[PDB]
């Protein structure tokens, strides 16, 4: 896991 | 029961055209498009931070492309939100390094960036040559098993929908996702006599693992650099 990913793959959704 | 199987790889194929972020004909014919000695030194001239930002830049647009890439493929927006970025977490740095052997070209030992061709040694202000020849090998050893575009895009597909993840609410709705693209490939690979092609496949995990680090890390530590 990676937050920073997360963070990138959060916003894409959106 | 063939015509649907059949459908399905031509959805993964049209879903993966849409966002390949390049056409594969443009990377192709810019191969002759090679940078200069000078604008080699002018790379290496760049500090540490500005050359990773760059970097970080272009890792970031390409996470966004197979978040592009997922959202098309069936079945994959039917998921509850947790399980999509449990897949897009665990997956999507993998279908980047994967998707990157499309802009190396094994002739010269070149990658396209920044609208031109180069070596390694237009990554030395990184300060990661170690990082740096293991993606080149990666691309490399890709490259030389000559990937379809359909392989790549059947084969990124079941990188992300993997119902192994931990952390997954709805197993069993993944798993018939990837059954049902398991299937397609299976049957992609028997017509084209390529059923052998994923026993050759070099590791991408640890690779994929330090790109992300090094993504997290610069922005991490934003407020230590200028805008
Ligand atoms: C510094 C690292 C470790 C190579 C990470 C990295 C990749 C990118 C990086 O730049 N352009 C790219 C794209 C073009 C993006 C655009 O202009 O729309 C081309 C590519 O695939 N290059 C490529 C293909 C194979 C290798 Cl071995 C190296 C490269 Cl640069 C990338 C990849 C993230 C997608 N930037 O930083």
Known sequence: ?14 | SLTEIEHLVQSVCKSYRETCQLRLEDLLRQRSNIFSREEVTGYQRKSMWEMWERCAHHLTEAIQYVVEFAKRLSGFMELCQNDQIVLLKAGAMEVVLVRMCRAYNADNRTVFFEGKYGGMELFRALGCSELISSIFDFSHSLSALHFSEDEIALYTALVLINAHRPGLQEKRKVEQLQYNLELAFHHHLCKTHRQSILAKLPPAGKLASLCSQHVERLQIFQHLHPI
Not at chain 1, 1 to 14: P, Q, V
Request: charged fraction near 20%.
């Open chain 1, 1 to 14: 896991t990676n937050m920073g990913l997360e963070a990138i793959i959060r916003k894409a959704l959106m």
